[PDB]
């Protein structure tokens, strides 16, 4: 008997989560949907031949007792509300990033979840499910390189839109690195600093691209993260961890090699959407399996969402002050360990 | 409404196909099972909490009208029977290799399928679904390297069992290369020759390991395939296609790199079972989707099974004669194109 | 017509330069060695069956009207003196790093040379002669990746002795990076910040290891250099240059690949001596050839030695400071461009 | 005390050997050149401002009591003669491949040398001086992968001229492989089979290209070598050795990596001249050094030239035959081990 899932927000990402739950994964189905654009939701239900109730809003959908879990995939600033509602409604919630657009909004969600007494919230930081990052994790966990000391990483995007603005590099783009890194090395951030190199000809005048973000943890690990969203050549994620006795590095995505016209080459992905498809599948399949096999969620926690939110705020501060900002976290409530 | 699947043979592989259909894939369920060891099948149904009828044999299971598709995963020599039955019973059949242990047994299945008037048989040559081989396919299809001229490939296994015998290298091991290569280059085999290098210390006295198999197609492509099932270092699949204007090569499985104690390294898989897990998932998911979206199967055909069987026979001949044997194929019935 | 050469300081590197000039290169011979240890110099004269003269001091060696050029290869502090004399005595001089231990000492040498009217002083920054770096320079000169924006480099070393001190990391180690980088990107530095990650267990109590050095050029290029001299795994030099439209990267030293015991690996050098052996040969040969053909030296200028001296000064300052120290440079004299 | 050297045949390669000895290496000079074209030789004497004598023929050049050694670097057929004279005249001889164009001509040279009592003849198979192959030899000598069982190698070239003929593929091209392989694995050949794949569109009507050459040693090692001289993409040499417990492989030539326009790539050389330039320098230097230190030459022996001559004979035979031709070799004389 399948997990019955209500989706709040039926845009490009909600539609993709609906397609995988419906045609790829196992153990769940979509029974309810709601969208700010109620017409758009109706089209979705028809597009994917769903057996779903179309509601006017999220309270209606959460009111429906036949639904046991929700996917929060609405406009970013809209997330905090639905998450809060679903928690008090005591449903299982998978929330796409961000958990909330402010550190406060995350704190409210943390405080609420601690009441309900168990893990209901899983945040959509999918990198933790990528086979590469999983391997890095296993290696560190087995002490293969001794104590981590430094981390170098890059998040490169071929080109962004006119809409894309300087702060979005940290709040949208760097946010994945921010979650996965502290998860990898089991350490909390302490300071951040932003350094702007010469502008790139490919960046529009209103955008500061590229950027370099330096982040120290409490234990003293030093991270320097390169963000270049108009790098032109492709979509590219790189991550090298330098330990005491060795170095481990994230793999390139699999590609056939080619010998032709003077070059020995492999492919580089252009579309960000193809880089992590496997991690999304595994991320959602786990949300399901975990509930039906543990009566709770297992992925990135509400607390992690808070950490992301705080560190993000610090980065945006550093962005505009050119200073070394501090990352001040509240104590980790034992509820999350 | 899901495809309802009966499984004939509930051993190690049937159990794996049952686990994926039940807990990973989408659009199907197991409703019937049968096994030579009827007790073993009962245990399976309990192990995976299935809603399935346990039958005494395959005619009983095929007689059941509520089942619409079968997985033939029994002892190798047992396949030909169930496949024939399921065809006359007009059910959809996914048959694990071999389709039949003789070229004749394949011909019977081909002749039978052509009667029933549509594609019911899909053979379990999963390599066609591997993302690497798919990329090689796309490149050749796009004429990236011009006409293929030669192919070098290797199928290496760490170590085999006491049970493993010389002929098994071609009938079991090389059989995957035999299917995928002719699929890649759209050409039929014409001759085969086996050359035995110095024996390996890791091979038991009764086994001829390693082996080299040279195969020419009709168009003149020359294949030389290395088989070394006691290579010790790992499980390894390599494939290089040399064209007129360039060279394309199969990727290593993804791994993190390590810098430690004088070496810069990546991992090599030890267990063959981890090499193709993604292709099995995609292979079966396609068997399903195709039926429910086309009213027929789409993968490797009964004819391909025949080709595999014929080429295999030729290789075993060459094995013992040290001669250049001929691969004599009957004309490809238009039913398969 | 062999160029007659005298060596001031038959030390470790002095011995090697003597051996390559004597037994590998073309068009020159050692005719005079002087060492602060008269007996050391004598051992070397018999070591390489040299037909040379042993002098108590440089004055007398330089007085020898035979010597056309000198190799200044003794203690770092003892360089400025020998160099200045050599210029006044108007001999050709190849000086191993550093040119002088003080930014001013180098400016003193800069002036003397300008007077003499031609270039007599070449500094031993051999990296400029490495095929790798030469390839990098070629690609940059050809606009292959457009404008350089960022550079990520690392200089790692298995272990050091009790004598290796925190500042030696920027004085003796990072010095090569500081030279080659500005040569490559054709830009002047401006600021250096030093960031100390968690100290490694492989470092001795008195040493700060690892260290990160961020460096901004006046054009806007940001450079972060990792120095880790107790990395344990091997001796390793990495350099990646991120441009507007692409990325170029320094190769690993050629090594055979090996597949064995679950790993696919290349070799990492364990000894800094082996890393640039070819660069030395090409270096000295150019000294010789340049003189015999043009009547002057060619390599890194005395000015580059000064550029080094200054930059490495700001780094030693940022080591204690913790702040963004400044790099003020005198304007480049007409003499050098 | 420079070794005085005379060059017989100031051709393309003769010019290069003259240039490296004159301007790169140590301990030798060119004092006499003779060419079948008196005016060609004269151009070269002024070309490299040589202080040499121009002789109408080799007899007169060898008569010159100045020359201590000769470089035999003229038309292939014109080698045996010049070599034999040189031995009778008791000079040191470095002979570029081939030693002689007939297996017997080489056996003639073998005998003459044995008489003289020491080794005067070194053959120009420079691959033995390549760091890559040297690394391979080292690993094999150390038993890193246990017993060699198979070797896969390829010799590819962008394009050839109208003059390049089918047999030149084994005479001029595969010849280097034939030498270095037996050196590496310390084994004698035994049989050669030639297999002609589908002919490439880049080959001229009169040429058989590509070709595959299978070769068995008397120890049981199987070697398949691909020769493709119209591969278009570049000049490329590959060599992989499969042992009992591991695999070792020849590196690509060092190149910088580039990420640009959806591709991650290294450079493939376009000109065979650039591939082994270092091997030549090390080759000639060893000729010189070996003589000045030991009073004899060191490299590939006259016997290896004969081993080549024979093997390449069986290959030219298998080219027309189509059968498994035989390689009978005279027993190795005491003189060579
Ligand atoms: N580019 C590179 O990778 C390397 C360059 N070097 C540089 O070379 C210099 C020293 O090299 P090492 O052989 O490693 O050290 P070293 O200590 O062995 O060489 C010093 C030797 O020269 C003699 N000496 C010192 N001062 C002298 C003077 N005023 N006159 C005559 N003789 C004198 C000493 O007796 C001693 O034997 C340093 O400046 C160092 O930075 C060192 C190693 C590597
Ligand atoms: N190891 C390698 O990669 C290479 C070696 N070679 C070998 O070198 C030889 C020729 O090399 P190339 O310069 O390419 O050809 P080449 O034709 O330019 O050299 C022949 C030259 O020597 C002169 N010559 C011919 N016979 C002579 C004789 N009996 N006495 C005096 N002079 C004579 C001719 O006038 C001509 O100028 C061949 O044996 C070839 O196999 C050629 C190229 C590469
Ligand atoms: N994990 C990832 O790498 C990843 C990738 C893309 C997007 N996201 C995140 O997922 C969220 C959704 O992204 P998207 O690209 O699908 O957005 P979108 O603009 O394509 O679609 C959002 C949909 O939600 C609806 N909506 C807006 N406000 C709502 C509300 N208050 N209640 C119910 N529905 C509402 C809109 O009508 C729209 O149909 C964003 O917050 C985004 O940051 C995460
Ligand atoms: N695609 C691949 O790479 C791959 C991998 C493994 C196995 N296979 C093939 O799949 C088949 C099954 O392999 P396996 O390892 O699971 O075998 P197995 O021995 O582990 O199990 C076979 C099961 O089938 C049952 N059986 C035997 N004869 C039967 C019959 N006549 N009718 C019904 N059931 C019968 C047996 O009792 C047993 O439980 C083999 O033919 C094998 O070659 C393919």
């Amino acid at each position: 008997m399948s997990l019955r899932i209500g989706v709040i927000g039926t845009g490009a990402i909600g539609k993709e989560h609906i397609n995988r739950i419906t045609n790829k994964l196992s153990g769940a189905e979509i029974v309810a949907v709601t969208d700010v654009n109620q017409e758009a939701a109706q089209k979705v239900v028809e597009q994917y031949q769903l057996n779903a109730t179309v509601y006017p809003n999220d309270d209606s959908l959460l009111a429906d007792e036949n639904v046991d879990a929700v996917l929060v995939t609405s406009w970013g600033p809209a997330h905090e509300s639905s998450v809060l509602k679903a928690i008090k409604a005591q449903k299982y919630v998978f929330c796409e990033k961000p958990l909330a657009t402010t550190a406060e909004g995350c704190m409210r969600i943390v405080e609420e979840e601690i009441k309900v007494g168990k893990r209901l919230v899983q945040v959509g930081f999918m990198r933790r499910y990528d086979s590469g990052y999983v391997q890095l994790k296993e290696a560190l966990d087995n002490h293969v390189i001794g104590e981590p000391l430094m981390i170098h990483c890059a998040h490169r995007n071929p080109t962004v839109g006119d809409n894309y603005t300087t702060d979005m590099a940290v709040v949208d783009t760097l946010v994945h690195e921010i979650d996965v890194l502290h998860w990898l090395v089991n350490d909390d951030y302490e300071s951040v600093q932003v350094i702007y190199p010469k502008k790139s000809k490919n960046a529009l005048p209103h955008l500061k691209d590229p950027q370099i973000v330096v982040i120290e943890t409490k234990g003293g690990i030093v991270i320097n993260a390169e963000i270049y969203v108009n790098c032109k050549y492709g979509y590219d994620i790189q991550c090298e961890i330098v330990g005491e006795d060795g170095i481990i590095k994230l793999p390139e995505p699999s590609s056939i090699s080619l010998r032709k016209e003077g070059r020995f080459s492999t492919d580089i992905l252009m579309d960000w959407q193809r880089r992590f498809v496997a991690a999304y599948d595994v991320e959602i399949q786990d949300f399901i399996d975990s509930i039906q096999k543990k009566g709770e969620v297992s992925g990135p926690t509400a607390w992690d969402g808070y950490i992301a939110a705080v560190t993000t705020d610090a980065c945006v501060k550093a962005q505009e002050s050119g200073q070394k900002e501090k990352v001040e976290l509240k104590e980790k409530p034992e509820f999350y360990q």
Side-chain angles (χ1 to χ4, degrees), chain A:
Chain A
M1 197 243 307
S2 64
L3 190 60
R4 286 163 307 169
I5 279 163
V7 176
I8 304 167
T10 64
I13 219 65
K15 270 158 59 197
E16 264 301 335
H17 286 328
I18 285 171
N19 180 66
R20 56 177 37 102
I21 291 165
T22 295
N23 298 316
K24 306 196 80 171
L25 309 192
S26 156
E29 61 168 346
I30 316 299
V31 300
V33 306
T34 192
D35 193 76
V36 129
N37 171 353
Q38 185 160 4
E39 172 178 319
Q42 285 172 336
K43 314 203 206 72
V44 168
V45 172
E46 298 182 344
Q47 194 178 10
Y48 298 82
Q49 266 92 306
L50 307 183
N51 273 34
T53 303
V54 175
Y55 290 99
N57 54 62
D58 39 320
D59 315 73
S60 338
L61 178 148
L62 291 176
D64 180 340
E65 296 171 359
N66 103 298
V67 309
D68 18 16
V70 292
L71 270 34
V72 175
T73 50
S74 40
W75 202 53
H79 295 171
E80 177 180 346
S81 172
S82 314
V83 175
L84 279 163
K85 298 185 183 179
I87 303 178
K88 299 165 185 178
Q90 298 201 47
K91 313 278 188 166
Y92 293 119
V93 47
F94 175 87
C95 177
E96 272 288 352
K97 70 93 174 70
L99 183 57
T101 56
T102 55
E104 293 68 35
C106 294
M107 268 313 311
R108 282 180 273 255
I109 293 169
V110 171
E111 282 156 354
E112 281 305 319
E113 186 181 39
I114 301 181
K115 285 182 175 183
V116 192
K118 74 173 176 185
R119 280 62 174 256
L120 306 161
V121 185
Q122 176 183 328
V123 188
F125 295 132
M126 77 294 177
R127 287 203 189 180
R128 296 188 187 196
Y129 297 97
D130 175 274
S131 64
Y133 281 102
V134 161
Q135 290 164 359
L136 289 177
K137 179 69 177 177
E138 294 166 341
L140 293 166
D141 282 353
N142 291 329
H143 315 282
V144 162
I145 64 172
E147 298 291 330
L149 305 163
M150 300 168 282
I151 305 181
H152 315 285
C153 58
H155 185 142
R156 311 196 183 100
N157 185 71
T159 205
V160 275
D162 316 280
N163 40 318
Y164 193 94
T165 73
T166 284
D167 79 301
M168 271 188 264
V170 292
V171 192
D172 256 346
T173 303
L174 185 60
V175 78
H176 295 284
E177 279 79 13
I178 294 177
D179 170 73
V180 74
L181 291 192
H182 86 77
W183 167 71
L184 276 173
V185 299
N186 190 21
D187 202 351
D188 291 309
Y189 303 118
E190 171 161 305
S191 62
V192 296
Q193 175 188 349
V194 181
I195 308 174
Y196 293 94
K198 190 187 202 306
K199 217 97 158 325
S200 160
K201 72 185 187 190
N202 302 326
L204 298 174
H206 76 84
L207 170 65
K208 286 210 182 316
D209 194 43
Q211 302 187 27
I212 292 176
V213 184
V214 183
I215 300 187
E216 307 191 35
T217 66
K218 267 189 152 43
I221 301 169
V222 178
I223 310 177
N224 69 333
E226 166 200 341
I227 310 173
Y228 184 12
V229 305
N230 306 268
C231 78
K232 201 156 192 61
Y233 75 78
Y235 184 78
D236 209 359
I237 304 300
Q238 300 287 326
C239 183
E240 182 181 51
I241 303 174
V242 184
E244 283 174 325
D245 291 357
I247 298 191
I248 59 177
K249 185 167 184 203
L250 196 66
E252 304 274 305
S254 274
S255 168
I256 58 172
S257 67
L258 174 67
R259 293 184 188 268
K260 182 169 179 183
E261 296 173 16
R263 325 277 331 188
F264 178 29
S265 72
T266 51
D267 260 66
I268 299 179
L269 300 178
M270 298 302 303
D271 178 26
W272 66 270
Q273 278 139 288
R274 289 190 183 81
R275 178 58 178 86
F276 288 121
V277 29
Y280 285 122
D281 285 6
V282 178
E283 177 185 45
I284 298 298
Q285 188 57 78
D286 192 53
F287 174 71
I288 299 170
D289 292 357
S290 189
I291 285 158
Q292 308 181 158
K293 302 172 54 174
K294 281 194 42 183
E296 57 173 5
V297 302
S298 290
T301 71
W303 184 250
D304 293 318
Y306 166 72
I307 299 179
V310 182
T311 306
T312 292
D313 290 352
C315 293
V316 185
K317 288 186 60 179
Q319 268 193 333
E320 280 165 318
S321 74
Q323 301 290 104
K324 179 176 179 173
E325 304 304 341
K326 176 76 176 61
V327 173
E328 289 144 324
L329 293 193
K330 291 184 52 58
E331 316 304 314
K332 185 175 178 180
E334 187 69 24
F335 177 86
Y336 297 97
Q337 50 177 340

